[PDB]
Amino acid sequence: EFRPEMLQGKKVIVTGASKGIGREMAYHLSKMGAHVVLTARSEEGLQKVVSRCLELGAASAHYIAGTMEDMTFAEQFIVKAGKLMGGLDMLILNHITQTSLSLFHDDIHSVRRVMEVNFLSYVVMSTAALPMLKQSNGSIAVISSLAGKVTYPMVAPYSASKFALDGFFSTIRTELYITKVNVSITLCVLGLIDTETAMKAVSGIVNAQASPKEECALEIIKGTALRKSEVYYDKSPLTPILLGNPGRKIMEFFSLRYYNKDMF
Amino acid sequence: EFRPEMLQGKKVIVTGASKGIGREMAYHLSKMGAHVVLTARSEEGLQKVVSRCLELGAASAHYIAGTMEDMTFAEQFIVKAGKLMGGLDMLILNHITQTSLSLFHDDIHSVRRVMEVNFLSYVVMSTAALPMLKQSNGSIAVISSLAGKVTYPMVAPYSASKFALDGFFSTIRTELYITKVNVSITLCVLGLIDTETAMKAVSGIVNAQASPKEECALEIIKGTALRKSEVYYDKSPLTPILLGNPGRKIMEFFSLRYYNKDMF
Ligand SMILES: NC(=O)C1=CN([C@@H]2O[C@H](COP(=O)(O)OP(=O)(O)OC[C@H]3O[C@@H](n4cnc5c(N)ncnc54)[C@H](OP(=O)(O)O)[C@@H]3O)[C@@H](O)[C@H]2O)C=CC1
Ligand SMILES: NC(=O)C1=CN([C@@H]2O[C@H](COP(=O)(O)OP(=O)(O)OC[C@H]3O[C@@H](n4cnc5c(N)ncnc54)[C@H](OP(=O)(O)O)[C@@H]3O)[C@@H](O)[C@H]2O)C=CC1
Ligand SMILES: Cc1[nH]c2ncccc2c1[C@@H]1CCN(C(=O)C2(c3ccccn3)CC2)C1
Ligand SMILES: Cc1[nH]c2ncccc2c1[C@@H]1CCN(C(=O)C2(c3ccccn3)CC2)C1
């Protein structure tokens, strides 16, 4: 079971922390006495949150600002964040590029930039951060969506980038497990959350019930601290079960016999 | 019930058709007596296969050479192809980048390479081809892997692009359907296929039984022609069931009742 002391004095990165879900995780982490380094495009939005974080009890709080469409920034940012803290216990990949609802029509340029920001910068940052994480037996939080397990109309690009997250990190997850690297990867599948940017976007298009961003943030943290493979945070009770996919678990367990053990 | 007569004289595009599964689908379509345009990087390799296709009885056979790493080629190929045949009934997106089995150690450049060719190019051509496919109510086939539904080690970049296909094209399908477009989208979930490449590539790493390439090809063509959401071909029979994932289906279904039709 979870104890906030588990994050006390621990080094934690959070991308997308200037608002929404990722700001809330900044506060919760700050109240648990972790060291945090935060980042986003908005330099002023990052300032206010670090300032709140310090009032909230954070051992230390630093921002670095930029855009995660730039892979150079994505990687160098991890390196500065590990130098400011002297290590890295937890990498939480949360930011996403400006998304809207709409039927797909001819966006090669939209699809790419989405893929880079919502997928590429995650892979960039995971691998840059993995040496420091391997040293601490740390954990990654990869924040995804029901739309990373099932599909909804009007969100083809975004949805491509979340599916890609499962495919990729799930594979990293097993590989780590089989080569005995004690780093955990939590895929955090979430339903509608009442962040300001989600509601504005669904307005007049989707009429679902949203869940609170504060508690959402909480389950993400606790799930990753507890080295869980997946977190499901959604309003409906019949979500983790209809999304269970017991076949995928069965296939993944047996597929290993296909492999030469020496490879591992 | 599938009738090969169905494809006599139809206009088909096949990618990665200079060898492997791609080459088989061209042969088959040719015996059915269809028009084909083939593409891939190999100039002379493409030539042997067109010469062969014409020998088998293809209505027509042409090729356009190039790399699908370049989106400009990807769009413009579909345009030249369309002209060459005067239209399009079936687009087969099949090509993939050089792919090796190994624990993940790629740098971002390589991973972008994987996602551009394996994924981004697929989105590009289906977008470009869509107008003719509407013109003819044709079909799209997206060649995926079991690795696009569940995870296997040593294949995370590949598995990502594959997962990114299910997410994107499943969305497009739903969107085409709620808007009454008569273009169908067939995701083909393949198991190990005894193509030269994969066999020598799994050599010493994976000991599974392969499915025959000639049949695989036909099962692709049959499904896309019958307009199936998904095709499953793999030596094990208990596979399509386990990968059934009825919950996702049940869930994608009720999901529309939370939308406003004014967007239809
Ligand atoms: N709320 C919901 O309904 C659901 C949310 N999720 C996932 O939860 C996570 C966070 O959601 P949420 O808090 O609502 O999102 P928000 O839109 O509220 O904010 C996310 C963060 O991303 C940052 N950001 C935006 N663009 C860039 C960029 N180009 N480079 C770097 N940072 C950027 C934002 O800061 P800034 O603009 O200043 O750069 C912001 O701090 C995302 O991964 C989302 O996909 C998943 C399912 C449902
Ligand atoms: N074989 C198997 O066991 C399985 C295969 N699949 C899927 O089946 C499909 C076909 O695979 P397979 O026939 O076995 O592999 P092959 O290597 O035999 O064929 C791949 C084709 O893609 C072409 N190609 C490679 N790179 C590019 C590029 N950058 N631009 C354009 N064309 C390119 C190749 O030609 P050239 O190099 O000259 O460009 C070749 O014709 C793939 O999508 C794969 O994921 C899925 C599950 C299992
Ligand atoms: C577009 C967009 N921009 C955003 N900026 C910030 C946060 C969320 C979003 C979003 C969508 C809105 C909700 N999102 C979902 O993934 C869920 C969903 C999708 C489609 C239909 C029903 N639900 C809730 C699962 C993410
Ligand atoms: C490496 C490599 N190069 C290739 N060049 C051309 C075609 C396929 C491949 C491939 C692998 C071989 C098998 N592939 C799979 O996607 C499946 C799988 C993966 C892992 C373990 C058991 N099965 C069959 C599903 C793709």
Residue A199 makes CB contacts below 8 A (sequence gap 6+) with A210
CB B79 within 8 A of CB B128: yes
> Would you call A229 helix, strand, or coil by DSSP?
coil
Radius of gyration (C-alpha) of chain A in whole angstroms: 18
Would you kindly state where each structural domain of chain A is located, as residue ranges? 1-264
Amino acid at B262: D
Kindly give the distance from the C-alpha atom of residue B169 to the centroid of ligand 3, in angstroms, as a whole number.
Answer: 18
CB of residue B22 inside a 6 A radius of ligand 2: yes
**Vertex A176 angle, CA A135 and B113, to 5°:** 105
Residue A165 makes CB contacts below 8 A (sequence gap 6+) with A118, A119, A122, A142, A144, A148, A187, B160
Residues of A in contact with B162 (CB under 8 A): 167
Q: Given the structure tokens 């088998």, which residue do they identify?
A: B56
Between strands A230-233 and B139-145, the pairing is: unpaired
Long-range contacts of A197-202 (CB under 8 A, 24+ apart): A197/A19, A197/A20, A198/A20, A201/A99, A201/A100, A201/A101, A202/A101
Instruction: Work out the angle between the directed axes of helices B20-32 and B213-226 (0-180°, nearest 10).
Output: 60
Q: What is the resolution of this structure in A?
A: 2.3
Q: Of A63, A158, A232, A233, which one is the catalytic site residue? A: A158
CB A12 within 8 A of CB A36: yes
Name the region of B87 (left: φ>0; alpha: ψ -120 to 50; beta: rest).
left
Handedness of CA A244, A245, A250, A252 (dihedral sign): negative
Q: Given the structure tokens 């994050």, which residue do they identify?
A: A7
Cα separation, A2 vs A227, in Å, equals 11
DSSP type of residue B212: P
Question: For A167, which of B160, B205, B252 is closest by C-beta distance?
Answer: B160
Going by C-alpha positions, the residue among B251, B117, B95, B98 that lies closest to residue B174 is B251
Going by C-alpha positions, the residue among B3, B21, B4, B7 that lies closest to residue B144 is B21
DSSP type of residue B62: E
How far CA B153 is from CA of A74, A171, B160, in Å, comes to: 25, 5, 12
Cα separation, A219 vs A232, in Å, equals 9
Kindly give the distance from the C-alpha atom of residue B96 to the centroid of ligand 2, in angstroms, as a whole number.
Answer: 4
**B233: annotated active-site residue:** no
Tokens representing residue A122 in the block:
């995650």
Instruction: Strands of B87-226 (E only): list them.
Output: 90-93, 139-145, 184-190
Residue A20 makes CB contacts below 8 A (sequence gap 6+) with A193, A195, A196, A197, A198, A213
Tokens representing residue B194 in the block:
């005894």
Going by C-alpha positions, the residue among B187, B168, B178, B184 that lies closest to residue B230 is B187
The number of angstroms, rounded, from the C-alpha of A205 to the middle of its chain's C-alpha atoms is 26
Ligand approaching nearest to the C-alpha of A200 = 3
Amino acid at B54: L
Helical spans, DSSP H, in chain A? 20-31, 43-56, 71-85, 108-115, 121-136, 156-178, 196-202, 213-225, 246-254
DSSP type of residue A257: G
Q: Which residue of A has its CA nearest to B107?
A: A124
CB of residue B2 inside a 6 A radius of ligand 4: no
Residue B112 makes CB contacts below 8 A (sequence gap 6+) with A116, A120
- CB count within 10 Å of CB A241 equals 11
- CB count within 10 Å of CB B5 equals 9
Handedness of CA B189, B192, B193, B199 (dihedral sign): positive
Residue A240 makes CB contacts below 8 A (sequence gap 6+) with A232, A234
In ligand 4, the atom with minimum distance to the C-alpha of B154 is 20
Going by C-alpha positions, the residue among A62, A231, A252 that lies closest to residue A146 is A231
Residues of B in contact with A243 (CB under 8 A): 247-248, 251
Q: What is the 3-state secondary structure (H, E, C) of B130-153?
A: HHHHHHHCCEEEEEEEHHHCCCCC
Instruction: Strands of chain B (E only): list them.
Output: 11-15, 35-40, 60-65, 90-93, 139-145, 184-190, 230-233
> Would you call A206 helix, strand, or coil by DSSP?
strand
Going by C-alpha positions, the residue among B105, B197, B109, B204 that lies closest to residue B155 is B105
Kindly give the distance from the C-alpha atom of residue B97 to the centroid of ligand 2, in angstroms, as a whole number.
Answer: 7
In ligand 4, the atom with minimum distance to the C-alpha of B100 is 1
Residue nearest to atom 36 of ligand 1 (CA): A41
**Solved using:** X-ray
Domain B1-264 has CATH 2.60.40.1180: no
Pocket of ligand 3 (CB under 6 A): A 99-101, 145-147, 152, 155, 191-192, 195, 197-198, 201-202, 206, 208
CB B116 within 8 A of CB A135: no
Q: Given the structure tokens 């995780």, which residue do they identify?
A: A25
Q: Of B122, B158, B232, B233, which one is the catalytic site residue? A: B158
Cα separation, B159 vs B244, in Å, equals 19
Tokens representing residue A233 in the block:
């945070």
Residue B254 makes CB contacts below 8 A (sequence gap 6+) with none
